[PDB]
Amino acid sequence: KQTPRARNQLKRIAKMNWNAIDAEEFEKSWLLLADIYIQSAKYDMAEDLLKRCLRHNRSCCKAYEYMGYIMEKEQAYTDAALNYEMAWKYSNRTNPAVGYKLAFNYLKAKRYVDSIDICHQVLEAHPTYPKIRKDILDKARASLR
Amino acid sequence: RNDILAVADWGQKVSFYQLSGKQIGKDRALNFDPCCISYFTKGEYILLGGSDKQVSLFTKDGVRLGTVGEQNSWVWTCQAKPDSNYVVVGCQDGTISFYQLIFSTVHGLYKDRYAYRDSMTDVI
């Protein structure tokens, strides 16, 4: 919980340029700094750093999840849905919460069939995962016609 | 009265009910949400589509026989031509596909005996 010290340290770290030997350390550093920024409501620079991390690696699931959350905060339901879908795909659908967010974003974007598909995928992955049958699946089913 | 209603639920099952409310046999467990159940001209086979991006042919008892078409979205309707083997499939992507179903002759003959496939599940 020495959060300001971590923020200053990651500000220092982000100044140095990426290299071919410490790529994963760089990605962890950028991810943690994005975490700190999102916690402090600094969405702009967190978005910038996340785009940087995705530029240096095109299959960082956590970065895509963070981007989806950011686009949700701005109600960018299409962009949030795209990012959440990418994270859901690259994680090999082992994180039911990501599927929950993705199905919710499809539902809000009025894409009912895709929301139902993602809900079915999540429930097949976890039949006991609650708050998905009613909060998402039932509402999507009721809005088909 | 001997009438059969085929029922495609969104609990992912297909049931067959008599007009008196009694059920015929057990349910047929499905792993997809059905959206269309129908029949051929003489009611010999059943067509089933839906959450699976494909259309399947079933015996009138509900035993799966094979795949008619593999689509790219939910099949919202899976009707069949009134007096032919042709089937038409309309999906959410807007695609409409017109298949002609062809059944292969499966038979053997030895001298004075001839076995063939009848009703896709029986041997005569």
Would you call A110 an interface residue with chain B, using a CB distance cutoff of 8 Å? Answer: no
Structure tokens at A113: 């069939």
Q: How close B33 comes to chain A (CA, Å)?
A: 9
Structure tokens at A77: 């339901």
Method: cryo-EM
Residues in chain B: 124
**Which residues on chain A are in Cβ contact (under 8 Å) with B77?**
none
Per the CB < 8 A criterion, the answer to whether B8 and B30 are in contact is no
Q: Which residues pair with B88 in a beta bridge?
A: B98
For residue A41, count other CB atoms closer than 10 A to its CB: 9
A–B interface: beta-carbon pairs under 8 A:
9
Name residues whose C-beta falls within 8 Å of residue B71's C-beta, 6 or more positions apart in sequence.
B53, B54, B55, B89, B91, B93, B95, B97
Name residues whose C-beta falls within 8 Å of residue B122's C-beta, 6 or more positions apart in sequence.
none
- Cβ separation of A113 and B92 shorter than 8 Å? yes
Per the CB < 8 A criterion, the answer to whether A143 and A109 are in contact is no
- Cβ separation of B33 and A120 shorter than 8 Å? yes
How many Cα atoms within 13 Å fall on the side-chain side of residue A109?
21
